[PDB]
Amino acid sequence: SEKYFVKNGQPHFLISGEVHYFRINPKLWRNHLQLLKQTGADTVSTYIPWDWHEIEEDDFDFEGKTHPARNLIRFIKLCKEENLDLIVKPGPYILAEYENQGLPSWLLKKLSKNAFALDENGNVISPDLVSYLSDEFLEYTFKWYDKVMPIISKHQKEHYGPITMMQLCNEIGVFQWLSGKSDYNPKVINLYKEFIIQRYKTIEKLNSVYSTNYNSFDDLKAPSGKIKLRSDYCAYFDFHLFFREYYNKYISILKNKIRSFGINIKLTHNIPGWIYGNASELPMLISTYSEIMKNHPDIIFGLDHIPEFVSFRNAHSDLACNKILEAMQPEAPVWAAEFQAGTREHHVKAYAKDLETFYIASLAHGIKGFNYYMFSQGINPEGKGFYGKTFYFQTALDAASNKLALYDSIKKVNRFIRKEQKDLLRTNVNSEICVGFYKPYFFTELISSQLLKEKKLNVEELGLYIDPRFLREEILFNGLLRGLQTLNYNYDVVDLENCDLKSLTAYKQLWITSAEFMDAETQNLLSEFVLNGGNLILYPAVPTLDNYLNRCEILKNNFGIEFITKDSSHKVSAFGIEDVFTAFSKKQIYNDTNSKPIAFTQENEICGIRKKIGKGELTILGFAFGYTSDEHLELIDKLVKLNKIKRELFVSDKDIQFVVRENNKSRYIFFLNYHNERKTFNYRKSKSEEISIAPFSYKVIKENK
Amino acid sequence: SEKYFVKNGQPHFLISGEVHYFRINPKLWRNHLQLLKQTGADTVSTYIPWDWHEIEEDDFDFEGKTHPARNLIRFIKLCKEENLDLIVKPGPYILAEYENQGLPSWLLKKLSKNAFALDENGNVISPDLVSYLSDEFLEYTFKWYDKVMPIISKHQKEHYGPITMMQLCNEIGVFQWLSGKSDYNPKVINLYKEFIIQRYKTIEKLNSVYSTNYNSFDDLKAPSGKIKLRSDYCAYFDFHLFFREYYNKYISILKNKIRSFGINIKLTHNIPGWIYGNASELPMLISTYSEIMKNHPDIIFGLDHIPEFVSFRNAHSDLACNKILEAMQPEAPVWAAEFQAGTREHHVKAYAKDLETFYIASLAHGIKGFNYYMFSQGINPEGKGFYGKTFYFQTALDAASNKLALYDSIKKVNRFIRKEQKDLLRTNVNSEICVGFYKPYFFTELISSQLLKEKKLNVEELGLYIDPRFLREEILFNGLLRGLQTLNYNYDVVDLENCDLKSLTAYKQLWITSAEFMDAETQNLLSEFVLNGGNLILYPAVPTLDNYLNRCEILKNNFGIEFITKDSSHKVSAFGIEDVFTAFSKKQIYNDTNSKPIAFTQENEICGIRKKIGKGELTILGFAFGYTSDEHLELIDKLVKLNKIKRELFVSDKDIQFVVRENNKSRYIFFLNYHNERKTFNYRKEEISIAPFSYKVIKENK
Ligand SMILES: OC[C@H]1O[C@@H](O)[C@H](O)[C@@H](O)[C@@H]1O
Ligand SMILES: OC[C@H]1O[C@@H](O)[C@H](O)[C@@H](O)[C@@H]1O
Ligand SMILES: OC[C@H]1O[C@@H](O)[C@H](O)[C@@H](O)[C@@H]1O
Ligand SMILES: [Ca+2]
């Protein structure tokens, strides 16, 4: 059942700490490694910066001949001497608050304009932002790999070295995302045109899908500018599919290059998306990796968690992200490649009290491994800091190797993990609720995001009213997922793409947050799910279009639903809850045929029904709610209770979060107080026990079954 | 010298609680009022919703004839019986998460298209958003005033009644701001044309300023779409000046109508701008009231503070907003018309332990009065809630008058306030730093804001690189003001408009965050300031343009400055601090004749100088830094120390914030812990422990 890392045929919690040799006095490297090992950590992790080691074009130093902290070889040897396994991350990009994101200054001065990401006008977006498939960029990247990869290969575990894992590049697409502009480099334009010709084969076939009138493929260009017609939406949809293939081509090229050096260790990649302490856009960025995860079962993706604080304001972000990684990568453990320790920026504090709670909450939320980022502070040598001289603050160790407050928090957490890992790693929560992940709603990084400078998608111009980004942020991430976690109902997330019917029928309920569009394959899957005995909850819309916004009424027809879309007050009544505020004036009005009406508009028109279809049950709500009122929690709770799903515990304070993890031998009860209140409460399993929990604090109770 | 409310001829801290009679079971009105009074509160505050009382056109109920909670008259009687003064807020707009923002449904169903705020295409922006100077809207507003104002007039403090203050409308421009669109209603456009003719007199004068090619004012159109040309910037700038006159015309029309009923109590207005627990846009919104504040010294503006939490993440917002209100309104107390109690949003928690600290921090930060918003929760009657059934959560009292956790926090704070008010209200901080407030940098709500749906202002299209909203948000509000607060250096803010030279001379340093444009009057003011002996810190640019982007180099020439704008790495060195991250590649590179170079690019070009001019001192930095590294705090500290300015205390833990407030005989030291850490420290001009997100106040007799 559970996915976890294994060592010596036993479950093993991966505990790594990030220690940047290049930012630490090499006379203190050993002390940093000893103090990390003394916390119970098994692994150390570092970037190997291209700029740091290719000091001028074709002049390499890995031995500290020109600066003692260029002695990568000695750092590798110390990791082995201090019995730590090593994760190496040689880029080409590292980010790492390093000048030019780790690319050499000499490189960026030499590269031609066509090596850079370009805007719609052909202008350079940023002087450190390359176009990934640039011939010149990949030539210099390969020359870098030619010098660093033999060193990595020599020091792998299979040659009795400490190196067990290597990250390829760093958060692919993060630089493009943060710039707020997409890449229109000519390599992108030309590879896109090849993609479209391969995809459609004839211009007649493309025109039939898009409803365009092109005479030839030579008339068609990568889409630019705002979406005004459904044909512009179609063009951008394919452009999103293309970018997923483009990032798969990039990582495939790096992987094939590294394998040529005899490097057989585990390859990793790291997922961006937290900003200002929440992760509602992370699902968009993880979706850009869809083709990499389909084609490379041997690259393990891990999350980059940057909570910044730990409170009800962001409590749901880490669990939703952990669940969405599991959905997209169900055969590998859920791990954090970067797991916040300290703060990347002086003005954004990172308190030990918060992060210690985050670490325990992460265990509650199913994490199987992590890399404390940053375990060790660094001091940039030679002006290499992007933003200042000091690299991170409020870490476990300062750059000198002094213990800071966070060290004691990590020791406490790691001690618990080491004591419990053989049982805890094998535990699961009992999820009776499955939530669908429909990746195409996330495919909007070119047209609609929190970071994109230009809003290119306005669905009203297309005759639609449900924006897929509004749906996936407010109705799903901040809405349903936040609500279920707040209500202490366990859920799983399943990727609906090529999804096995047998993997949905384990759940008492499947929840689908739907826009007006959904592909035929997914409409058919949800149809079969209900006909064969599944219980489906679907809102705010029965879809009637496919991903190209062409007619597709499969689910509507299979479920025998008739509806009209009508304007009314935002407030509806649902299951006897009055004044439920909904997101839209427009609602689906269902006729009551062979159904029980359960939701009504202010004019008493039917906007939600329940029915029995084949061996299954359907609940459809023709209105949108996330979690912006107490009525929304009441409605989620009522929906869950339709199939008699029960919480694992009765807890006297509804603002206490809990998670029960168990196997045949052991039960762990995690209590999380995400609130600035001392809470005294009682609980019992579904004679009560009393607990007092401080503000922003945790309790963990272990029972031997 | 301090400004404060007065009761019984003594300094009086205004402690008001918001209690919406229209959202409370009338059987429990007395119980809510008694529980509010038992916290030591002196005043209760409420809207009087137009929709609630004009139940159909020309059918008024203020006596509970049709619903017991329409008995406004009984509520007023209970306030008197329970010895509370009353603040009333009859609109016409109330917002208050009330359907139609408090306008009657029957009114919105009946109004013509031309009564509504319209976008660039002539479409209605929102079915509850009227154009303020709509004739139809003012006709019906006046008929509402005709019924509610005689009731207020009878019960006003000038007739020895309980009503001490009345708010006119609610956060003027807030609906416009939140809609993300500006009003192009044809009456508004006609008033804008009248405003332009009044301002320029002749089309030749307007053409000389804008570089336009009109033959007459008949050719003139309201600016729309993106700014591509400097002439489009000019038209939008005057469109901003016009909206400030427009809001003054609206509030003048309401005030004159109110005064006609013999209402001579204090009139108020309330300032919006907090969102997601910070207030970096509130200075833009307060700038929209510039003409109201200049023309109506009898209308007291108060702040609507919505911190949501209390930590280092938002510690600087309330101080900066309080200081900006003081700059724009120096002759009235700084007070919060809405002072967060509970939460408007169930999913956005408001912890009693957070807000208790916010209340004490607000005292440290110079607040003189406030209105707990919401003291009492409400239940929306008859589906009249904009949102769900319940109005506010985690308040002092629930809608049934049950005491909640916040009640005891408010009782505690109120007891400290009543014990200390006579001395505390007469205290000020000793500011030796003044920070300039240049209002034109804030006049962008039509073209650039956090809420505007399309950015119309792209300064690179105008041949500029310093965006005024970036400057005022990241370099000023979240940069310099946050850094000074964090470093525990007192500052004052001064409005540079019509500013007295005499008012700047008391300060040891004037800090000016400058874009490439600044009007002649302000350039002249800053020139005279330094020549006469003042010490000026100016960055990131010596301005070379006026507000119409026409050449204006008064300050530059008067100070003998020469520069070239050149591209370099973002990092500079300044005062021996290496690796100072700056916002722009473009920097001013100064000629150093008769100057001391003090900052350098990565290629060692001079991007900052110090100089003696007349009797004074100039420090100019040709680069933009906010607060995103420890080097930024070090640079601000180095700059303050150029004129030997000292903190009032030595505190062993640099992450403890303090404010020293004094008068001739009393000192209050407010220690504030904005961090999730128990901190132990000592202080001197003596060892204290403060819990996470908490406070300690110390008194010292002088
Ligand atoms: O916060 C925005 C982004 O900043 C980047 O520097 C981090 O590497 C990402 O993980 C993060 O999502
Ligand atoms: O077990 C001791 C731990 O208890 C938790 O409840 C607290 O949040 C931690 O601050 C503390 O280290
Ligand atoms: O948060 C955005 C705005 O919301 C409005 O409902 C409040 O009345 C304002 O004070 C506030 O700034
Ligand atoms: Ca000169």
Side-chain angles (χ1 to χ4, degrees), chain A residues 346 351 354 385 571 627 675, chain B residues 346 351 385 387 571 627 675-676:
Chain A
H346 193 263
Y351 308 116
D354 292 342
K571 292 194 273 309
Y627 169 33
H675 308 285
Chain B
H346 189 267
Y351 304 120
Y387 299 110
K571 286 185 300 166
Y627 168 34
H675 307 286
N676 192 3

Side-chain angles (χ1 to χ4, degrees), chain B residues 425-635:
Chain B
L425 286 173
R426 289 185 299 156
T427 65
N428 196 29
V429 304
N430 170 40
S431 291
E432 289 178 348
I433 296 166
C434 183
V435 180
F437 186 57
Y438 185 64
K439 287 186 297 211
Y441 295 158
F442 297 79
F443 289 10
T444 76
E445 72 278 0
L446 304 171
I447 65 185
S448 180
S449 80
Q450 294 168 37
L451 278 287
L452 198 68
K453 285 226 161 55
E454 58 144 346
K455 215 97 336 285
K456 298 179 160 184
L457 182 64
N458 302 282
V459 298
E460 327 74 358
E461 298 215 39
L462 305 178
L464 303 177
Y465 65 99
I466 307 168
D467 178 279
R469 178 164 75 84
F470 175 77
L471 179 76
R472 80 206 193 220
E473 291 182 356
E474 303 311 342
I475 304 308
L476 179 68
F477 190 99
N478 292 331
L480 176 59
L481 301 190
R482 185 182 199 179
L484 293 172
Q485 182 181 324
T486 299
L487 286 167
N488 295 307
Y489 288 123
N490 296 313
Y491 67 88
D492 290 347
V493 176
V494 63
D495 181 357
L496 293 169
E497 185 186 20
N498 298 134
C499 175
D500 214 32
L501 196 274
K502 237 179 135 111
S503 74
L504 300 170
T505 75
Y507 297 102
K508 287 190 203 169
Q509 294 183 331
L510 180 58
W511 291 55
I512 300 298
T513 52
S514 179
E516 300 167 82
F517 62 95
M518 184 185 284
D519 58 25
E521 308 90 82
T522 309
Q523 291 201 38
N524 278 317
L525 176 67
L526 297 180
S527 300
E528 291 293 306
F529 174 75
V530 174
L531 287 167
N532 288 324
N535 305 307
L536 174 66
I537 299 157
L538 169 77
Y539 65 97
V542 180
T544 55
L545 297 175
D546 62 22
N547 290 336
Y548 296 91
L549 309 185
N550 291 320
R551 200 175 219 71
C552 182
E553 298 192 330
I554 292 166
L555 183 156
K556 177 184 188 297
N557 295 333
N558 286 353
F559 290 171
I561 299 165
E562 302 87 26
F563 71 82
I564 302 167
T565 305
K566 297 198 207 184
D567 281 296
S568 57
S569 149
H570 286 257
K571 286 185 300 166
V572 305
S573 59
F575 300 100
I577 307 164
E578 299 269 50
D579 295 299
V580 179
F581 183 81
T582 87
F584 308 121
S585 39
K586 290 170 198 284
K587 295 174 196 56
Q588 296 192 338
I589 305 306
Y590 299 113
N591 179 293
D592 65 337
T593 312
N594 199 34
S595 312
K596 179 179 177 200
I598 49 65
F600 305 91
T601 70
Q602 285 314 294
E603 334 82 44
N604 212 34
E605 296 204 82
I606 301 168
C607 56
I609 55 166
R610 282 178 51 82
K611 196 176 191 169
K612 300 185 172 56
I613 294 149
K615 302 180 203 179
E617 308 180 2
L618 177 65
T619 308
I620 178 159
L621 311 172
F623 58 85
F625 67 93
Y627 168 34
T628 64
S629 66
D630 54 298
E631 285 89 355
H632 293 155
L633 295 180
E634 196 175 346
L635 176 54

Side-chain angles (χ1 to χ4, degrees), chain A residues 346-471:
Chain A
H346 193 263
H347 64 297
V348 181
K349 308 311 188 175
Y351 308 116
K353 176 72 180 180
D354 292 342
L355 291 177
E356 192 181 318
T357 297
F358 188 75
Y359 301 159
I360 295 294
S362 293
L363 299 176
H365 293 159
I367 209 159
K368 302 293 185 172
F370 43 65
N371 174 52
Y372 292 111
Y373 193 103
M374 288 303 295
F375 186 86
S376 294
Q377 176 181 66
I379 297 169
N380 289 290
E382 300 275 287
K384 303 301 187 178
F386 196 101
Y387 294 112
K389 291 178 304 300
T390 304
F391 177 65
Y392 263 71
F393 309 88
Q394 302 177 288
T395 53
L397 300 182
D398 68 13
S401 82
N402 300 123
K403 297 172 182 171
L404 299 184
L406 188 69
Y407 189 94
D408 245 276
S409 290
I410 287 181
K411 204 161 181 179
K412 292 157 91 300
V413 164
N414 290 356
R415 181 181 314 280
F416 171 78
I417 292 168
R418 290 304 190 212
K419 179 182 181 66
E420 291 308 333
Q421 62 189 348
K422 282 166 163 200
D423 277 352
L424 176 64
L425 282 176
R426 289 194 263 234
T427 62
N428 61 289
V429 310
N430 176 28
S431 292
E432 294 186 320
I433 296 168
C434 186
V435 180
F437 183 68
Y438 187 66
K439 286 186 296 218
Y441 297 157
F442 297 82
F443 292 7
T444 75
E445 72 278 1
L446 306 166
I447 60 181
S448 187
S449 80
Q450 293 174 36
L451 273 291
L452 192 71
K453 279 171 196 292
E454 198 191 349
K455 280 291 127 286
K456 293 186 168 184
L457 178 63
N458 300 287
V459 301
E460 297 89 357
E461 298 200 41
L462 303 180
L464 303 174
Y465 66 99
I466 306 167
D467 179 286
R469 178 162 78 94
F470 174 82
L471 183 72

Side-chain angles (χ1 to χ4, degrees), chain A residues 5 165 266-270 297-302 329 332-333 335:
Chain A
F5 300 99
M165 319 184 91
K266 186 72 183 183
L267 301 180
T268 76
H269 200 66
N270 56 327
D298 64 328
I299 301 173
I300 183 174
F301 278 74
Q329 182 176 260
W335 103 283

